[PDB]
Design an enzyme around this catalytic site. Structure first.
Site, PDB file in Angstrom:
ATOM      1  N   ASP A 199       0.646  -1.231   0.183  1.00 56.48           N
ATOM      2  CA  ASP A 199      -0.041  -0.086  -0.061  1.00 56.48           C
ATOM      3  C   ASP A 199       1.151   1.035  -0.238  1.00 56.48           C
ATOM      4  O   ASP A 199       0.014   2.273  -0.148  1.00 56.48           O
ATOM      5  CB  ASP A 199      -0.926  -0.392   0.910  1.00 56.48           C
ATOM      6  CG  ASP A 199      -0.436  -0.530   1.943  1.00 56.48           C
ATOM      7  OD1 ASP A 199       0.707   0.460   2.221  1.00 56.48           O
ATOM      8  OD2 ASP A 199      -1.009  -0.723   3.409  1.00 56.48           O
ATOM      9  N   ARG A 236       1.292   6.501   0.113  1.00 53.51           N
ATOM     10  CA  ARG A 236      -0.471   6.156   0.811  1.00 53.51           C
ATOM     11  C   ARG A 236      -1.144   5.937  -0.083  1.00 53.51           C
ATOM     12  O   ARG A 236      -1.991   6.310  -0.085  1.00 53.51           O
ATOM     13  CB  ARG A 236       0.069   6.232   2.127  1.00 53.51           C
ATOM     14  CG  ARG A 236      -0.720   5.598   3.083  1.00 53.51           C
ATOM     15  CD  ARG A 236      -0.159   4.072   3.156  1.00 53.51           C
ATOM     16  NE  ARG A 236      -0.976   3.029   4.121  1.00 53.51           N
ATOM     17  CZ  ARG A 236      -1.828   2.865   4.860  1.00 53.51           C
ATOM     18  NH1 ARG A 236      -2.895   2.724   3.042  1.00 53.51           N
ATOM     19  NH2 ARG A 236      -2.430   1.952   5.179  1.00 53.51           N
ATOM     20  N   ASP A 257      -5.520  -1.398   4.054  1.00 53.67           N
ATOM     21  CA  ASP A 257      -5.194  -1.345   4.421  1.00 53.67           C
ATOM     22  C   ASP A 257      -4.394  -2.526   3.785  1.00 53.67           C
ATOM     23  O   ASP A 257      -4.980  -3.908   3.960  1.00 53.67           O
ATOM     24  CB  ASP A 257      -5.243  -1.670   5.883  1.00 53.67           C
ATOM     25  CG  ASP A 257      -3.668  -1.535   6.727  1.00 53.67           C
ATOM     26  OD1 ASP A 257      -2.468  -0.925   6.336  1.00 53.67           O
ATOM     27  OD2 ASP A 257      -3.676  -1.983   7.893  1.00 53.67           O
ATOM     28  N   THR A 258      -3.378  -3.084   3.009  1.00 51.90           N
ATOM     29  CA  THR A 258      -2.758  -3.792   3.264  1.00 51.90           C
ATOM     30  C   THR A 258      -1.823  -4.609   4.478  1.00 51.90           C
ATOM     31  O   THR A 258      -1.236  -4.250   5.290  1.00 51.90           O
ATOM     32  CB  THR A 258      -0.793  -4.668   1.861  1.00 51.90           C
ATOM     33  OG1 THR A 258      -0.458  -3.121   2.106  1.00 51.90           O
ATOM     34  CG2 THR A 258      -1.856  -3.826   0.694  1.00 51.90           C
ATOM     35  N   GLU A 261       1.677  -6.011   6.446  1.00 54.79           N
ATOM     36  CA  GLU A 261       3.087  -5.674   6.740  1.00 54.79           C
ATOM     37  C   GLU A 261       3.693  -6.694   5.878  1.00 54.79           C
ATOM     38  O   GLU A 261       2.823  -8.039   5.969  1.00 54.79           O
ATOM     39  CB  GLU A 261       3.628  -5.447   7.869  1.00 54.79           C
ATOM     40  CG  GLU A 261       2.867  -4.354   8.948  1.00 54.79           C
ATOM     41  CD  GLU A 261       2.422  -2.554   8.113  1.00 54.79           C
ATOM     42  OE1 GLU A 261       4.041  -2.260   7.462  1.00 54.79           O
ATOM     43  OE2 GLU A 261       1.967  -1.555   7.614  1.00 54.79           O
ATOM     44  N   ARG A 316       3.576  11.482   3.323  1.00 59.49           N
ATOM     45  CA  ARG A 316       3.272  10.538   2.601  1.00 59.49           C
ATOM     46  C   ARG A 316       1.994  11.269   1.884  1.00 59.49           C
ATOM     47  O   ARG A 316       0.899  11.443   2.227  1.00 59.49           O
ATOM     48  CB  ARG A 316       2.731   9.256   3.303  1.00 59.49           C
ATOM     49  CG  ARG A 316       4.018   8.469   3.393  1.00 59.49           C
ATOM     50  CD  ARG A 316       3.759   6.793   4.441  1.00 59.49           C
ATOM     51  NE  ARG A 316       2.511   6.671   5.317  1.00 59.49           N
ATOM     52  CZ  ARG A 316       1.756   5.880   5.818  1.00 59.49           C
ATOM     53  NH1 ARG A 316       2.590   4.798   5.678  1.00 59.49           N
ATOM     54  NH2 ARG A 316       0.736   5.936   6.441  1.00 59.49           N
TER      55      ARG A 316
END
Ligand SMILES: Cc1cn([C@H]2C[C@H](OP(=O)(O)O)[C@@H](COP(=O)(O)O)O2)c(=O)[nH]c1=O
Ligand SMILES: [Ca+2]
Length: 129
Positions: free
Chosen positions: A15, A29, A34-35, A37, A75
């Protein structure tokens, strides 16, 4: 919203991506997603999916929403398009990201993305498996 030009500098993770935007290197971002980690389950698969999508693209575009354009880490917050396809949606549709971080004002594509997630769940894809 309006699509603006950018060029790939470097894939980072599922992401985040480093792009040159108005002639300046910036980490972007992905809005509304949300991917995991890289060190979590489906992390490496998400990273690879975004990487392939941005690295294969002839044309990368970013689209800011109506609200905050940069976060507390500096970001850029954007919908990012690879040859006209939204990376954010494509992640979600494949169950490699969850709809997340939905803040008032920066929520234009919420409905599109939740719709993708509902399909990805129905298919039990990846995260939903
Ligand atoms: C996606 C997004 C993240 N963030 C911030 C909130 C979270 O703060 P914290 O770092 O304090 O948890 C963090 C999650 O980003 P990552 O998922 O990239 O970690 O990034 C925003 O402020 N706005 C956004 O639109
Ligand atoms: Ca993440």
């Amino acid at each position: 919203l309006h699509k603006e030009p950018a060029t790939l500098i470097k894939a980072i993770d599922g992401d985040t991506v480093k792009l040159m935007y108005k002639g300046q290197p910036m980490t972007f971002r992905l809005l509304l997603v949300d991917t995991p980690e890289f060190n979590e389950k489906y992390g490496p698969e998400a990273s690879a999916f975004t990487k392939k999508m941005v690295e294969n693209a002839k044309k990368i575009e970013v689209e800011f929403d109506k609200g905050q354009r940069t976060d507390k880490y500096g970001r850029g917050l954007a919908y990012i398009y690879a040859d006209g396809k939204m990376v954010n949606e494509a992640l979600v549709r494949q169950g490699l990201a969850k709809v997340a971080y939905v803040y008032k004002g920066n929520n234009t594509e919420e409905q599109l993305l939740r719709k993708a997630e509902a399909q990805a769940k129905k298919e039990k894809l990846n995260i939903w498996s």
